[PDB]
From a paper:
In the present study, we deepen the structural features of CrTRXh1, providing the 3D structures of both the reduced form and variants in which catalytic cysteines were mutated. Regardless of the reducing activity in which TRXs are involved, the N-terminal active site Cys (CysN) is responsible for the first nucleophilic attack on oxidized targets. While the subsequent catalytic steps underlying TRX-dependent protein deglutathionylation and denitrosylation are yet undefined, the reduction of protein disulfides implies the formation of a mixed-disulfide bond between the CysN and a Cys on target protein.
Thioredoxins (TRXs) are small oxidoreductases that contribute, in most living organisms, to the control of cellular redox homeostasis. The redox activity of TRXs relies on the presence of two Cys residues in the conserved Trp-Cys-(Gly/Pro)-Pro-Cys (WC(G/P)PC) active site motif.
Author numbering: 1 to 112
């Protein structure tokens, strides 16, 4: 129950990145896997933050095994990974399930 946009394909990924560019809003992405406990531990927080920052920050989810072409091009190797995209390109990242660092990352880019 939040505002996260699920990415199903490279085409969908490219469209969302272009939307963030056109809107001048930052995108935060959770690259996640069903088999990762840490991903499960932080997924509820990602969803809550998508509500708290609705209208300000765009939240995407990429299941790395469902959309392997996007995970590979993004250079993912540990789960969860969070990226921030601005102007169609990567601007920031976090790897791991630190709730404090995720909250701070979203706050930073919402305030920038």
């Amino acid at each position: 129950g939040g505002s996260v946009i699920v990415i199903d394909s490279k085409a969908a990924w490219d469209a969302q990145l272009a939307k963030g560019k056109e809107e001048h809003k930052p995108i935060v992405v959770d690259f996640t896997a069903t088999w990762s406990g840490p991903c499960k531990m932080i997924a509820p927080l990602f969803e809550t933050l998508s509500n708290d920052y609705a209208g300000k920050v765009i939240f995407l989810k990429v299941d790395v095994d469902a959309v392997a072409a996007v995970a590979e091009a993004a250079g993912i190797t540990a789960m969860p990974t969070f990226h921030v995209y601005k102007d169609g390109v990567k601007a920031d990242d976090l790897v791991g399930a630190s709730q404090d660092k995720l909250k701070a990352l979203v706050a930073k880019h919402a305030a920038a």
